[PDB]
Amino acid sequence: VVKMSPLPTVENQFTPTTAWSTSVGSGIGNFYSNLHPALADNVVYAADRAGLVKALNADDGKEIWSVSLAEKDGWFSKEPALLSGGVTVSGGHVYIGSEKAQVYALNTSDGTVAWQTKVAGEALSRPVVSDGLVLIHTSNGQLQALNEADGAVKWTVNLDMPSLSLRGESAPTTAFGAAVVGGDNGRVSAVLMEQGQMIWQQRISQATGSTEIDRLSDVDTTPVVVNGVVFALAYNGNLTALDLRSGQIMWKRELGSVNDFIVDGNRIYLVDQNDRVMALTIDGGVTLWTQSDLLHRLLTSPVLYNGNLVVGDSEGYLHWINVEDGRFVAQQKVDSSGFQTEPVAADGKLLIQAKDGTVYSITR
Amino acid sequence: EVPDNPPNEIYATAQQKLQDGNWRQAITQLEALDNRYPFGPYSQQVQLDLIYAYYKNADLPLAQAAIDRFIRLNPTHPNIDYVMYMRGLTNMALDDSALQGFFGVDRSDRDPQHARAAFSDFSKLVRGYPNSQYTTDATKRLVFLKDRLAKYEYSVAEYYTERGAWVAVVNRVEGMLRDYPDTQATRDALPLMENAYRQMQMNAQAEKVAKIIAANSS
Amino acid sequence: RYKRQVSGDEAYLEAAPLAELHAPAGMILPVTSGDYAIPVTNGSGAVGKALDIRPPAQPLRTQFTGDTASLLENGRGNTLWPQVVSVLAQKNYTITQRDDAGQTLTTDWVQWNRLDEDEQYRGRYQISVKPQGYQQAVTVKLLNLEQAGKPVADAASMQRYSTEMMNVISAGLD
Amino acid sequence: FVVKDIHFEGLQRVAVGAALLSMPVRTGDTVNDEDISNTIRALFATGNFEDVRVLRDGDTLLVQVKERPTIASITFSGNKSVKDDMLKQNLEASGVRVGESLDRTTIADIEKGLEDFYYSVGKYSASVKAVVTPLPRNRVDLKLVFQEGVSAIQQINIVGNHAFTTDELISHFQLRDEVPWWNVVGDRKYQKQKLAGDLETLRSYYLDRGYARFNIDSTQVSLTPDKKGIYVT
Amino acid sequence: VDCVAAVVNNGVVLESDVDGLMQSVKLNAAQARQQLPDDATLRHQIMERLIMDQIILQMGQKMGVKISDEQLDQAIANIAKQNLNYNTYRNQIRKEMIISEVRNNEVRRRITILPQEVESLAQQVDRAYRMLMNRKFSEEAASWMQEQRASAYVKILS
């Protein structure tokens, strides 16, 4: 066995505490997915692997409704469901997906199902909704469009699977009348939702090696658009800002090597697989600063909060990093379960979920 | 376990103690010397001593591997007659020696394989370089191996005659006389052919081969 | 003896020599396959234990052409003759019967090589002449009659070893 | 220009006559001063040499040439999943064995091949490293370092099916995701050929029960972004 | 005098040939106003150019690509009106043209084009289709040369 596990030291300036813990209990466990509770209008929504979904009231975690999703369609009527789709909510509906290639559209406060529809390929993507249609990306290379009225599969547009690959297929981002998604071979592809057509794509991932077996070299992260420009990261690197007009690249930065990043709208903060948190400018492409105290410690996506950036860990300890050159503002021993999800920060509230700790919220 | 010192002394000691006959310690020294001096001025002499040691130390298969390494290493050497004769001798020695040798049991009706291989090797040698020093004893070995193979085929034909499958005997003895017409085995196998023809109700050929006996009454 | 002989399974010598099979008139024996065929071959070769099994000595332009040892390309080739004198006696209790200095023309004396293998004193004579053909002053040693245990013998194996002892001496020391 | 005597620094394989056969320049009379480059190209294209530098200071073609060094032995450490024997026959069969030359193209080839074999084993935290040790008399010896940390199977699903439960299918697969506490019957490593055989078993299970219109639309392996967990669908 | 510089795959670099091409190109670069730096970066650029065209040579030879003397005659006939030893010039031109031809072959083997971005660029400003083709060729060539630059097996001896 080989691995280096440095310990971030105990530096403190603030003393925040956990807001509460509804403690759903069995969450995801040893499995891996992209789940994260979705909050809107002072109400949060969380889900369980077995098929349990809870609608809690925010700022206290008070339970409103909670329904199981036992597979009544199955022979036993209570078979395991294996939900892995991201928790999303819009309009009067809340959308979830399962590892068994099934998408659920509920009706929020009611707790029942608005409609159930089948999807070709396992749902391993964060569901997104816009222009009266929902995008679902499966672990077979297909993106599909659905109608929030009732299903109405618009298309099943496949892209590729290069045999061996990695999970967490990217959730497309939509703007300017077009939705762009990543790809398991680097062809970051844009689609017009009017007819689901393939307009433009280009290779992003650089694999300058002898064989492509070890060179996975795929992009499975959500892009972001600013103005005629989008940002994406491949596993092997290839940070780039590329034009919305067509497949053109203004500039390239071969560091990349992240499966989930975030942008401040002015600057970009990202976490390499070696835990190297890098800060970047949109135009100059300069590495503003770094903090590599952690050595491939399996961190999570970063989120801005009170001016500092929030980082979890499989050790289950909350961490802050300073916007000023990168420092250890504070460390919180929130629990000991472990953390894998993407934290969410809105309405002056930071929520993050754990394998067994489940619903955790912060208080200053 | 071995002295990493200049080569002159290790060669000298190697030939000196092979001259003694200390094969158990000579093989290791020679193989280490060869593996650490792959292209010495006279590595051919090293390989030949390795052949000698392996044969005399009764490690025949590795000796065979060394033979077929040397033949491809330099198919044109002014001493290849010795190597070919050593290969044939290795085959023959591997073939027939056991408790039957003490008991004098006739090793005829045993598995030939190695006998055929040895015959082929010796024949290739003798037809290659008749002016060499290893032809006379080679020719005697050819004669002996031919007799052995003929006796083996005669024995199997005799067993089939004992059973009563009076066709396969015809084919086997026909192959014998086509291949081995100048040996004692056919000389006493012809009556088996006559008996098979007589029992086969096709005597039109029987007396025919009987005339063969008429030419070798002695 | 377990030293210089083939395995003791030598009863194959007294096998019956092959005799041909007559073909009567009126029919013909089938054509011989010829795969197992032996042609007529010469004799005058030692057989059985009398036959020698020893690795022929590969000489060290390392000349190996049997009766000759003409190795060769040094500008100071004439200085090799006093080196040969140093080899004789001084280095190995040897002596050249008639060796001129400049001419590099010498005649070897009857030596005695007791290199085990029950090989008694072997008296090898030779002529030491240094030619310069196709190169600078070359080394050459044309051996002559050898005695060994017997009064005389001319087997090319023992002759090859007898010339090769001087050959390996010369190669090793220079 | 014109040359009379020709010599070379190669003795391990360069036979002067064979070396002369290797160069068609005839080693004599006038030459065009540039076809020597093409002749040298031919010499090196024989593949038995490493470098050459012609010296025309005097009047002999005493070309300094160096061939491929021979390997003294084969040494290695680090591997424990597979016994070192099959590794040494893997090296031997590929074309490299004790006593012959060295070819660095084969060094890269065998490096990638052993990485591929480890990926087949499922040990993706593997990096074979080659250590070259030059030795006098133009020898070389190669050491191998194998830092294999740990392999992963963690998920199997049969998505697409509707008439059979997943577990009963899992009861037939050679490869198992996990086995309960009161038994040690099965391990948890990933072998691709095992997956292929498992697919054959699944296909036979469906076809022999009447479902003739059946095939395998698509099978996907997947790796977690830690190189510590593999799933199959 | 004559040495060997480097060896990539089965190709070899010669100081004689590279010095010849340097003295052939630097005289023209004198009036071309190409500010070549000292032999450090000059060495870098010359060695990279050499390894690119020679690896194209060995890849083509492995893949079995040939050109006949008729195409060489066509090329030299064109170059007669377009603008050592004549046969040597023929040889060098043949190798460079076959290098370019194999480059085009591989690029076409790994290029892509969709008749669905043509309308957007046509309405934004058939020549623009040629501009698209040019940009795709440039990006494909750059990507391929960088990805085979290190993936190829190269050793440096000088």
One DSSP character per residue, A132-176 reads TEEEEEBTTSEEEEE-SSS-----EEE----SS-BS-PPPPEEET
Residues of B in contact with D99 (CB under 8 A): 35, 38
Q: Two tokens at A113?
A: 């199902």
**Yes or no, beta carbons of A199 and E147 under 8 Å apart:** no
The neighbouring-strand residues paired with A303 are A310
| β A249-253/A262-263 pair status | unpaired
Question: Residue B39 is nearest to which of D12, D72, D98, comparing CB atoms?
Answer: D12
Q: Two tokens at C146?
A: 């050898």
Residues of A in contact with E151 (CB under 8 A): 208-210
Within 8 A by CB and 6+ apart from A306, the residues are A364
Residue A116, helix vs strand vs coil: strand
Q: For the purposes of burial, counting CB atoms within 10 Å of the CB of D10, is it exposed (0-12), middle (13-18) or buried (19 or more)?
A: buried
What is the CATH architecture of B1-218? Alpha Horseshoe (1.25)
What is the identity of the amino acid at B94?
L
Rounded CA-CA distance C125/C119 in Å is: 17
Question: Would you say the C-alpha torsion B153, B155, B156, B161 has a positive or negative sign?
Answer: positive
Residue A6: closest CA among A255, A288, A315: A315
Beta carbons of B32 and B38 less than 8 angstroms apart:
no
Rounded CA-CA distance B71/D69 in Å is: 23
Note whether D205 contacts A: Cβ–Cβ < 8 A: no
CB-hemisphere CA count at 13 Å for C19? 9
* Chains E and A lie in contact, requiring 3 or more CB pairs less than 8 Å apart: yes
Q: DSSP secondary-structure letter at D159?
A: B
Question: Residue E116 is nearest to which of A197, A210, A245, comparing CB atoms?
Answer: A197
Residues of D in contact with E157 (CB under 8 A): 51
Query: What technique solved it?
Result: cryo-EM
**Yes or no, beta carbons of B19 and C117 under 8 Å apart:** yes
Residues of D in contact with A32 (CB under 8 A): 224, 229
Which residue of chain D has the CA closest to A184? D222
Residue B130: closest CA among C51, C40, C35: C40
Rounded CA-CA distance B177/B185 in Å is: 9
Beta carbons of A287 and A281 less than 8 angstroms apart:
no
Question: Starting from the edge strand earliest in sequence, which strands make up the sheet with D230-232, in order?
Answer: D155-156, D230-232, D221-223
Q: Two tokens at D153?
A: 């199977």
For chain A, the straight-line distance linking the first and the last C-alpha, in angstroms and rounded, comes to 39
Beta carbons of B148 and B101 less than 8 angstroms apart:
no
Residue E27, helix vs strand vs coil: helix
Which chains share 3+ C-beta pairs under 8 angstroms with A? Answer: D, E
Rounded CA-CA distance D182/B102 in Å is: 62
Q: Two tokens at C18?
A: 């092959």
For chain C, the straight-line distance linking the first and the last C-alpha, in angstroms and rounded, comes to 37
What is the identity of the amino acid at A180?
V
Q: Two tokens at C42?
A: 């010469």
Q: Two tokens at D5?
A: 């005597």
Residue E10: closest CA among D109, D68, D47: D47
Residue A40, helix vs strand vs coil: strand
What part of A 120-149 touches D (C-beta under 8 Å)? 122, 139-140
- Helix or strand holding residue A37 (H, E): none
Within 8 A by CB and 6+ apart from C131, the residues are C70, C137, C138, C140
Note whether D169 contacts E: Cβ–Cβ < 8 A: no
Question: Starting from the edge strand earliest in sequence, which strands make up the sheet with A173-175, in order?
Answer: A173-175, A178-181, A189-192, A197-198
Resolution (A): 5.2
**Yes or no, beta carbons of E4 and D52 under 8 Å apart:** yes
- Helix or strand holding residue A119 (H, E): none
**Yes or no, beta carbons of D99 and B35 under 8 Å apart:** yes
CB-hemisphere CA count at 13 Å for B188? 12
